[PDB]
Amino acid sequence: SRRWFHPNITGVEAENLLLTRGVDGSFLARPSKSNPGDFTLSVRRNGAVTHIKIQNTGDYYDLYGGEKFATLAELVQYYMEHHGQLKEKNGDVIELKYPLNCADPTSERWFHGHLSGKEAEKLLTEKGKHGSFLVRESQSHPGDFVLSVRTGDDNDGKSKVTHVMIRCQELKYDVGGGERFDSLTDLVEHYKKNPMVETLGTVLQLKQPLNTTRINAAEIESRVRELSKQGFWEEFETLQQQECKLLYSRKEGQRQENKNKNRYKNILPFDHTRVVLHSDYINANIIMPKKSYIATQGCLQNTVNDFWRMVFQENSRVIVMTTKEVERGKSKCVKYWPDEYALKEYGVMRVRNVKESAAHDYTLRELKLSKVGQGNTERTVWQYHFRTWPDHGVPSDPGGVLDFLEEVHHKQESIMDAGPVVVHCSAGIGRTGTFIVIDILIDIIREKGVDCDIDVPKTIQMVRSQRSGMVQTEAQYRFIYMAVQHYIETLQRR
Numbered sequence: 001s002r003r004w005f006h007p008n009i010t011g012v013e014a015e016n017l018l019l020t021r022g023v024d025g026s027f028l029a030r031p032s033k034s035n036p037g038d039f040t041l042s043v044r045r046n047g048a049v050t051h052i053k054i055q056n057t058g059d060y061y062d063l064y065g066g067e068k069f070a071t072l073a074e075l076v077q078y079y080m081e082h083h084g085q086l087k088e089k090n091g092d093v094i095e096l097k098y099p100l101n102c103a104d105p106t107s108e109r110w111f112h113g114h115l116s117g118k119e120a121e122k123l124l125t126e127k128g129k130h131g132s133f134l135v136r137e138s139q140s141h142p143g144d145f146v147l148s149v150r151t152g153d154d155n156d157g158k159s160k161v162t163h164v165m166i167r168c169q170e171l172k173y174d175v176g177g178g179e180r181f182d183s184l185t186d187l188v189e190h191y192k193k194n195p196m197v198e199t200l201g202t203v204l205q206l207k208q209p210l211n212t213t214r215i216n217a218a219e220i221e222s223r224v225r226e227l228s229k230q231g232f233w234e235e236f237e238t239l240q241q242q243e244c245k246l247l248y249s250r251k252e253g254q255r256q257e258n259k260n261k262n263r264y265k266n267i268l269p270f271d272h273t274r275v276v277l278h279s280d281y282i283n284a285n286i287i288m289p290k291k292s293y294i295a296t297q298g299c300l301q302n303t304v305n306d307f308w309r310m311v312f313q314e315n316s317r318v319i320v321m322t323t324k325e326v327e328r329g330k331s332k333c334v335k336y337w338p339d340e341y342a343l344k345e346y347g348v349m350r351v352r353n354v355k356e357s358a359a360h361d362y363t364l365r366e367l368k369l370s371k372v373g374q375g376n377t378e379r380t381v382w383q384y385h386f387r388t389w390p391d392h393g394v395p396s397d398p399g400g401v402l403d404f405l406e407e408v409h410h411k412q413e414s415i416m417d418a419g420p421v422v423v424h425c426s427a428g429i430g431r432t433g434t435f436i437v438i439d440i441l442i443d444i445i446r447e448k449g450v451d452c453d454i455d456v457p458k459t460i461q462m463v464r465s466q467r468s469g470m471v472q473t474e475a476q477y478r479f480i481y482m483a484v485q486h487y488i489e490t491l492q493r494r
């Protein structure tokens with residue numbers, strides 16, 4: 001559910017909150033507002049408060065003293081069910097028992113804050129379907145709210161927009177009668193499941209929030225203008241608040257004959273999208289939006305053979321490596337390719353490094369992949385190794401990635417019936433997710449023109465349902481917008 005995350009709260013406010021409205025076992029999560037990628041797991045225990053630091057440089061949620069995780073929902077869930085691992089540095093144990101729910105409706109998809117009643121009717125008239133609703137701050141009475149909901153059938157005749165007053169009196173919310181709720185979210189969820197019925201029959205059904213993220217790709221520059229007043233951060237954490245619906249099973253990655261095949265213990269592939277080898281386990285996920293992807297981790301020494309089994313089985317002809325072998329003084333991926341002009345065997349597979357071509361931003365390696373025994377199974381697999389990506393943060397200018405991405409797309413289209421494009425970094429969720437999302441959004445634009453419809457958060461959430469935590473930080477989220485805008489400019493400048 002992820003109500004335990006408080007988006008706009010200070011460190012001391014979380015202390016008072018756990019100590020007045022919480023008991024030992026209560027916990028919450030919060031970001032440091034000035035330091036992005038800085039998160040704290042504030043846990044109450046032994047009549048005091050324990051602050052556990054979490055850092056996200058772009059690849060994973062690194063919990064200090066603990067493990068690394070793909071999302072905060074998977075972090076909190078892991079420790080609530082695997083009790084004993086979260087320890088107080090000095091041996092003592094931290095217990096996560098009672099999620100302290102937040103009341104802020106800012107990170108909700110349906111809450112539009114300081115929005116007028118005429119704008120709300122226009123957007124619902126234009127973009128809303130049956131059941132599309134929004135909640136805005138009250139035009140008339142300061143402090144109150146208005147639930148605007150569209151009903152009908154999808155205009156000419158019978159579709160309407162009903163406005164429901166939401167009174168807020170002494171921190172409780174109600175629709176003028178019945179039950180008073182502790183938050184706007186609780187009120188919406190209640191009438192989302194038990195919808196209001198009008199006096200003459202019409203059911204005020206809260207189906208889906210009014211979409212306000214889909215834009216015309218031609219006006220990308222206008223949306224980047226408003227997201228940078230903020231807009232970017234409040235749009236990204238609204239995306240992060242929907243990760244609680246993506247706790248799909250990871251039973252295969254958790255099995256113990258597979259625990260050594262994962263670079264990071266608690267970053268595992270979803271069971272319904274994982275790549276199955278013909279043992280059968282590799283930390284890799286099929287990503288589907290004629291182009292699909294394979295998002296996977298950087299190879300370990302004991303999974304290099306499994307990696308080349310996957311590349312062969314999927315008929316992949318392009319590999320995208322978005323990491324160095326060593327970054328931040330730690331190994332992020334094993335060298336799984338032979339030296340130039342050399343021929344090496346990785347299990348039942350054989351790879352020849354035909355020729356390496358060095359560019360400003362990347363190294364291109366023409367590799368010949370074949371299976372030992374079968375006489376003519378050779379295929380050219382092109383490895384695009386991006387090297388200029390920094391250790392922390394994102395590139396300040398998207399030009400190098402876009403040209404690196406344009407070259408990969410041309411390569412993939414030159415090969416008839418080529419399989420999915422293999423993308424990998426360290427954990428295979430951050431840079432890997434940022435790359436796949438940018439390529440997915442560009443593939444839409446390059447086909448159906450610059451005046452097409454793109455939805456950055458809806459695209460990311462779709463990709464996140466196929467692999468945990470695709471796109472890691474807000475800096476990457478912002479970089480996705482900047483990359484798509486730069487690509488939009490270069491075509492229309494041409």
Ligand SMILES: CC1(N)CCN(c2cnc3c(-c4cccc(Cl)c4Cl)n[nH]c3n2)CC1
Pocket residue numbers: 105106107108109110111112113211212213234235236238239240242457458461
């Ligand atoms: C004012 C606001 N609080 C912040 C800005 N707006 C939005 C609106 N839709 C979203 C999404 C999104 C879009 C499609 C599917 C899914 Cl699953 C998501 Cl999650 N991600 N992020 C947002 N931000 C309006 C509410």
